[PDB]
Task: inverse folding
DNA sequence: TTTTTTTTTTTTTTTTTTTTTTTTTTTT
């Protein structure tokens, strides 16, 4: 079939339903109550093809039959499913007794859908784990963010409300930004932490940081100047600390490689010593 | 660019040959006895004395002992804050620029923080691993230098054996110093 | 110019006559809160550690850096630094001490300029 | 309460309109590894079996339990269970199918309470 | 003693009349439509669905279809192990005690193992043979029951015709149920 | 003595052997080769009393001493002979140095001269073939056995050696014991398999079973408790399997009928179907 | 031909802010 997800519509003939999609998301299986009082199972996934996305809902025995067999990145082919309108007005694929799923199908539409040393890191690197020393603190600041998309919100003086360009009138949350450098003995890389991860490393609340930023701005400093000053004056104590950062490396058009850290954690010393023992064995020490 | 901080024993820093760059913007560096060019140092030791803060707060300093040597760590002006952080007895990790004052090598503090005793163990393991890695590479590079010197032919031979071109220049510079 | 002599890492049973400043790691077995002294056992021996101000707790694993005092009553250590080594992997420390003992003299002797 | 309908044993040529779940036994003659379909020949006909994950080999004797799919392209079986019937005595199976056909209705009709 | 596991069609178990013994030690049994007293069942079918193991491992179950009916097979506590053995599509032979839950007959797994397709054929042949043997014996026993009932005279007549005394009691019990 | 030929059994005390028999057959004397390379003589006769027949084997000087003195129809009395099992499983009388024969004695005895259903099985049944389902697993264990007689060997802590009561100092072999139940639809019977037959059915080596038994015993279980536990925890997979067992039925004074299986084999489905067809023909089906 | 001995049975389940990287020298 040439059918695409964009062509699905609620109530279309299940006999016409023939789409493929790569799995983007898998949600946990849930229980639901039937009209007769019994309890069934239901599980949802999000798939996408070259045209759009669809929620795929596995019902009852279809959960046991397929749910554990499917993983993110896999492609599935869906046949004979009922199409329903989602709560947002979009088509969803319901996998009931009649429906079938083919895991990693042979279909022409399919083609159309780690510890690394800093010296080896490249631009665009994904899922990189780097263990090193905090060497520099560039900036510490907090901004008002949307609680859903975490993007910067704008204060409207005419209406007295906070406006998110994606979600409209929202209640803002304080988001912490920590920019620092990390050294592993073979290289140096810039690192950025956000919100809860940054607050955990800094050991200071975002509301307290906002108050200190306000005091600096009142003195005649801009937001840029106040952020650099607070990092040097109050958060210099964090320098010299050995940590493990995990994230993706983006290349700034002048700042160079910046590691956007998704998480940070304390060094597992026994794990690190075992890595060193492996290297020593390779050198003919042990 | 920003070059790496090399993890070393204090003894290796102390016994090294400090090189003062004549340019007002060029970074100073040290060449160890094993031909290792070091711009920044990364050491793990114990603060042996209560820090020294000048009354006028112009400088702050503290002493670090790692078992192989004892070195002073200095912070100037507002950088005196680094010395105020530590206390006698703290087990710390220090990163900074190597400096030489009164023909005695020292560390110009860039960062100092308290570490867990297992970090001191990890530091010793890493320091020894890196040292062996470097010595074996420098031994092969020294043979290349004694046979060919710094020529286009020797640079090709060095790359084939996993040796950086910079290593041959360090050997030549060390021979010039000695 | 009496430059500070680095603390020489030793076991209680391996302390030498020529040693003036040492680093010992053990478990506290007795604390005398009146004479400010404590008994440190490392597995190889027991040393009497005279402390000036910091007294550890009984059963605490500690690292002591001190000057050796040789008198008619025996050899006691005047503690300079006492650190909490309670979560320290002494098995790993022992292994690195043996690696340094074997490999450090060989690395220095490889220099044939 | 839609209780699972037992698989009705049939020959490809004897499949009825009212049949929703069937059991067929035959030899694979063609396997399409891209559309996940295979051709099963039992001696009485050829059925196109659409499989979800298990694809047999060409020339393999297999037993298929599946739901019948009736569309504009014809009648294809969506395979639920595919079993290896390679060492199965189909001569004996055919003989027992005839024995059950003859004797089962007579046994039920013997009840005169 | 330990009575036999009767080889039957799933249909015969499903259409039967389960009898719960009031005693805490008495075994439960089923009486088929052809007056067959069954304490244990021996069936051969295909596992139609991937097994169901409760997250808390308190129970494990799997479904078996033989062509004449579909029945659930259950193992509790550590007996959940029986359900873990099988997979969707396996052709298996099951032996166990007949149970009734929610007025639906089921099999409390005592043993489950994969069988060769010729075993399924052998099972069908044996099931039919035993069924004919039983029906003919029960037909003669029913005539004895309708003429004399459960008397000392009818028990002697039953033994002479190769009928067990227990068969007359099963007929009487079945008449009481219906 | 009142002893009869029917009462002889292999290995019975030669001092108890006292039988009479009339000579039915005399075979020619033969030569045989001894273990030392020399050649001896041996001659056989068949005798019978009011109870049965026995082969009488005259060895070496007993041939010269008695063979020509005996004739068909004569009665002999046999004393102090060794009793052996013949090649057909029957008692034979061996007339060696110790044995005696009395020709035409004065004795009061002189004037007097398969496939089975479990429901049909009796105690003491021999060579019974039963096809059924494995229904229960009682115990799985291994013991140190003598490689000759296969009996349990004792470890002597004083000498550090393994002692067989029949063969002395021996090298022990691990013997597997499998106790289970078998059901044929008409009855239930207990079954015991040994060594190679049990290992073949279990699909696990005796050394591996010994290791698992050791782990269970170390936990605080006795040998009895550990054997029952291993059968339920690891060998429960064998239950539900259809097999053919052949053996002799012994009656335990509390456990009931136990079938000591000499061998086990997979079911020959065509052979079984033919047996069923025979039964169906008898019922008037075909 | 073998080890060691007490047979079986009921009931339990649902992706972000905002953007110009690094560097020397100063010490009671
Ligand atoms: Zn938003
Ligand atoms: Zn023996």
Result:
């Amino acid at each position: 079939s040439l059918m695409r997800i964009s062509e699905l519509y609620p109530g279309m003939d299940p006999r016409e339903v023939n789409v493929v999609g790569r799995v983007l998301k898998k949600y946990p299986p849930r229980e639901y109550t039937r009209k007769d009082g019994s309890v069934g199972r239901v599980a949802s996934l999000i798939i996408y093809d070259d045209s759009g996305r669809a929620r795929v809902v596995l019902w009852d025995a279809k959960v046991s039959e397929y749910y554990n067999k499917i993983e993110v990145g896999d492609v599935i082919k869906v046949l004979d499913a009922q199409v329903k309108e989602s709560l947002s007005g979009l088509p969803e694929l319901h996998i009931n007794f009649r429906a079938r799923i083919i895991l990693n199908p042979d279909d022409p539409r399919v083609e159309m859908i780690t510890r690394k040393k800093i010296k080896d890191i490249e631009a665009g690197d994904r899922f990189v784990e780097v263990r090193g020393t905090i060497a520099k603190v560039y900036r510490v600041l907090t901004y008002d963010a949307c609680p859903e998309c975490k993007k910067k919100v704008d204060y409207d003086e005419g209406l007295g409300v906070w406006i998110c360009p994606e979600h409209g009138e929202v209640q803002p949350i304080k988001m912490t930004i920590l920019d620092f450098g990390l050294d592993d003995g073979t290289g140096y890389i810039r690192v950025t932490l956000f919100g809860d991860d940054a607050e955990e490393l800094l050991g200071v609340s975002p509301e307290e940081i906002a108050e200190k930023i306000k005091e600096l701005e009142e003195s005649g400093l801009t937001t840029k100047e106040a952020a650099r000053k607070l990092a040097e004056d109050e958060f210099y104590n964090i320098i010299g600390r050995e940590i493990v950062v995990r994230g993706n490396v983006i290349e700034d058009r002048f700042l160079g490689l910046i590691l956007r850290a998704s998480s940070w954690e304390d060094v597992d010393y026994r794990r690190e010593i075992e890595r060193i023992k492996e290297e020593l064995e390779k050198l003919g020490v042990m | 660019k920003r070059m790496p901080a090399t993890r070393l024993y204090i003894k290796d820093i102390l016994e090294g040959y400090f090189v003062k760059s004549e340019g007002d913007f060029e970074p100073n560096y040290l060449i160890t006895k094993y031909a290792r060019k070091v711009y920044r140092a990364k050491i793990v030791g114990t603060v042996v004395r209560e820090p020294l803060i000048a009354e006028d707060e112009t400088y702050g300093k503290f002493q670090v002992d790692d078992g192989t040597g004892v070195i002073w760590v200095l912070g100037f002006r507002d950088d005196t804050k680094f010395a105020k952080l530590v206390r006698k007895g703290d087990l710390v990790q220090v990163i900074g620029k190597i400096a030489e004052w009164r023909d005695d090598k020292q560390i110009l503090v860039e960062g100092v923080s308290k570490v867990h005793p297992n970090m001191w163990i990890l530091h010793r393991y890493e320091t020894l691993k890196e040292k062996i890695e470097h010595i074996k590479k420098a031994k092969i590079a020294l043979e290349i230098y004694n046979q060919y010197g710094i020529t286009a032919k020797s640079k090709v031979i060095a790359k084939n054996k996993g040796i950086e071109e910079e290593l041959l220049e360090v050997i030549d510079e060390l021979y010039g110093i000695m | 110019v009496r430059r500070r002599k680095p603390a020489v890492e030793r076991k209680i049973s391996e302390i030498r006559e020529e040693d003036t400043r040492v680093s010992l790691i053990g478990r506290v077995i007795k604390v005398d809160k009146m004479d400010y002294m404590f008994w440190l056992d490392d597995g190889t021996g027991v040393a009497i550690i005279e402390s000036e101000s910091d007294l550890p707790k009984v059963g605490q694993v500690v690292r002591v850096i001190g000057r050796i005092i040789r008198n008619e009553e025996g050899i006691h250590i005047y503690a300079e630094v006492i650190q909490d080594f309670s979560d320290a992997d002494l098995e790993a420390l022992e292994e690195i001490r043996e690696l340094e003992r074997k490999l450090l003299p060989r690395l220095e002797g490889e220099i044939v300029w």
